[PDB]
């Protein structure tokens, strides 16, 4: 019943509204399996022609996949491996949030390369996420 | 004596048992277990003959058994009774075997290995029949004992893969029995054997086990061919569920050979030829594969003569099986030269030879094919040729008669000629020149389609082994 609001936010031409569209999916469908939710963020993350909107959609993905917090490293491996700095920045934050609640070693194994990554804000995001 | 021999034989078997045991009890990887049983077999066959025939029994007592031991004992009596050094205190130990479990764990009766060991124990029964090459009791007794027990299992993935190989032996000894002696009971038991395979085809499909599905299908089609019912086999292949999913290439080679026979006699030679070429390719090439190679090379050539083609002369001479392809070198020649007289004379000698390999059936229709080849020569030499001239060459009775024969052929579009009855000649109408028609677009559709097929196949298979290797530990 937020699916209508979401449509309009990603169809906007302002980079601000697509960024906040990503958390509109995040919070609407949080902790709950929805097909619409996971598929749309994944599309937004890749396809867009702005870099902030990529970053945001990844953080959004762990909010949708909150309860299923062990499946996040599988999906976001590709997004850790990325050529896009901002993609990578949002990947670290995503594990950060998702697996926040209790230890998950698998996540750490993912974030160990991201710690040592030579993009500076990738470092900043991984250093933070690990401790959560 | 007895104890020294039987423990030493058993020890070599126990090593083989631990290989199978780990895979089936941790859930199978389909492709790798299937291959290990094939290698297993060769060692086991030699071991049973060696160091007494009561070692198999001795092994049974030692390992955990719910009552499997009594099945091995009855078998032992047929091959001459032995029961010494095959009983407890010469044939029991619970320690170091997790394939019986420890002394303490047997007493608790909270452990289960009676299942998985029973399935393999049946292999020994089935081998012991094969090693001996005896029949009698062994044909009927092994068939009876083992089969209700595969239907006493609920039928798991691990367990179906194993019991697939028990069927080969049940089939081979029944057939071998049937051929040896004539009674009506053998015909009677033939029906019940077929039905059991059909039942079991349906159950394993539910469970999605491929090894079992393929196996039954192959054995039962041979049974239809030997009785000569095309109708049953043609209904059986149109059910159309034969698996390529988790099979061997030998299995594929087997299947294709049966389809070729059915398709060839249902007068669709194009497709029968295309399967028999593939049957040879898919099949391994070795000297333990010599029956298959010999009979598939024989059959293929009979299929080309049925088309109207001539197999290569060079096929027969450079085959190292040239001795048995002596009849076929002769037929290929008789058909080429077009002589009616030569074709009759050749088949009269090698009537028996052809009857063995089930290529005599093909040859009755090759009588028709003589005439056709002979007028294919006539079409290529002469473009306008009076009716009389054809009759003088080919010794044909009347001018009217040879026109009827040419009409039949040009209906099927092989000779591609057109008769002028009034004007008293036959005029070849073939001249091709078909790059001017749109037909080369259709030829090009197939080649691109063919190339496409490989481009999908490599891709799907290639990433598959790589996954495991990264997932697994490395040095």
């Amino acid at each position: 019943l937020a699916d209508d609001l979401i449509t309009k936010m990603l169809a906007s031409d302002e980079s601000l509204l697509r960024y906040g569209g990503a958390f509109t999916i995040a919070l609407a469908y949080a902790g709950t399996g929805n097909n619409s939710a996971v598929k749309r963020l994944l599309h937004v993350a890749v396809s867009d022609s702005n870099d902030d909107v990529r970053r945001a959609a990844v953080i959004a993905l762990g909010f949708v996949l909150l309860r299923d917090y062990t499946t996040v490293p599988r999906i976001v491996q590709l997004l850790s491996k990325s050529h896009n700095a901002h993609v990578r920045c949002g990947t670290a934050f995503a594990l950060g949030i998702a697996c926040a609640g209790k230890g998950l070693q698998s996540a750490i194994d993912v974030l160990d390369p991201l710690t040592k990554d030579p993009v500076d804000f990738v470092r900043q995001a991984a250093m933070i996420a690990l401790s959560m | 004596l007895h104890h020294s021999e039987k423990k030493y034989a058993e020890e070599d078997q126990v090593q083989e048992l631990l290989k199978v045991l780990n895979e089936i009890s941790k859930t199978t990887l389909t492709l790798d277990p299937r291959y290990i049983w094939r290698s297993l077999k060769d060692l086991s066959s030699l071991r049973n003959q060696e160091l007494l025939n009561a070692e198999t029994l001795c092994f049974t007592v030692n390992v955990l058994y719910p009552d499997s031991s009594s099945f091995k004992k009855n078998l032992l009596k047929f091959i001459t009774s032995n029961h010494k050094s095959s009983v407890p205190g010469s044939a029991e130990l619970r320690n170091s075997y997790p394939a019986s479990f420890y002394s303490v764990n047997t007493e608790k009766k909270t452990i289960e290995v009676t299942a998985e060991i029973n399935c393999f124990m049946h292999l020994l029964v089935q081998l012991f029949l094969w090693d001996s090459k005896e029949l009698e009791q062994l044909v009927e007794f092994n068939r009876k004992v083992v089969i209700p027990n595969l239907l006493c299992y609920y039928n798991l993935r691990s367990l179906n893969l194993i019991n697939a190989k028990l069927w080969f032996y049940i089939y081979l000894s029944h057939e071998t029995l049937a051929r040896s002696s004539e009674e009506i009971n053998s015909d009677n038991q033939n029906i019940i054997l077929r039905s059991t395979m059909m039942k079991f085809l349906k159950i394993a499909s539910l469970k999605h086990d491929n090894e079992t599905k393929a196996m039954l299908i192959n054995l039962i089609l041979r049974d239809f061919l030997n009785n000569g019912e095309v109708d049953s086999a043609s209904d059986f292949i149109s059910k159309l569920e034969y698996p390529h999913t988790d099979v061997s290439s030998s299995l594929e080679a087997r299947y294709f050979f049966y389809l070729s026979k059915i398709n060839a006699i249902q007068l669709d030679y194009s497709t029968a030829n295309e399967y028999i070429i593939a049957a040879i390719r898919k099949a391994p090439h070795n000297s333990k594969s010599l029956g298959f190679l010999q009979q598939s090379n024989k059959l293929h050539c009979c299929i080309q003569l049925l088309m109207g083609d001539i197999p290569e002369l060079s096929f027969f001479h450079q085959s190292n099986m040239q001795k048995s392809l002596l009849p076929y070198y002769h037929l290929t020649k008789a058909v080429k030269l077009g002589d009616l007289k030569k074709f009759t004379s050749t088949i009269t000698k090698y009537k028996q030879l052809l009857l063995k390999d089930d290529t005599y059936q093909l040859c009755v229709r090759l009588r028709s094919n003589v005439i056709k080849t002979g007028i294919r020569i006539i079409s290529l030499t002469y473009k306008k040729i009076s009716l009389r001239d054809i009759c003088l060459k080919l010794n044909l009775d009347s001018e009217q008669t040879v026109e009827y024969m040419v009409s039949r052929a040009i209906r099927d579009g092989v000779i591609e000629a057109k008769i002028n009855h009034e004007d008293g000649f036959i005029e070849t109408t073939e001249l091709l020149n078909i790059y001017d028609s749109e037909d080369p677009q259709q030829v090009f559709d197939e080649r691109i389609k063919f190339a496409n097929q490989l481009h999908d196949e490599y891709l799907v298979s290639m990433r598959y082994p790589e996954d495991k290797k990264t997932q697994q530990n490395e040095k």
Partner: protein, 50 residues
Amino acid sequence: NNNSALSNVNSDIYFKLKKLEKEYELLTLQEDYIKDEQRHLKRELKRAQE
């Protein structure tokens, strides 16, 4: 001899296996995602080369 129950497998199918089945639906979704992502780096690959 033996000690097994059949009760346990059947229970595990209604309870535990259904939650694994939600997870297999997600791997389907992943499958779809890496088609669009593969196409995208292909667009970018061309753009880099130019």
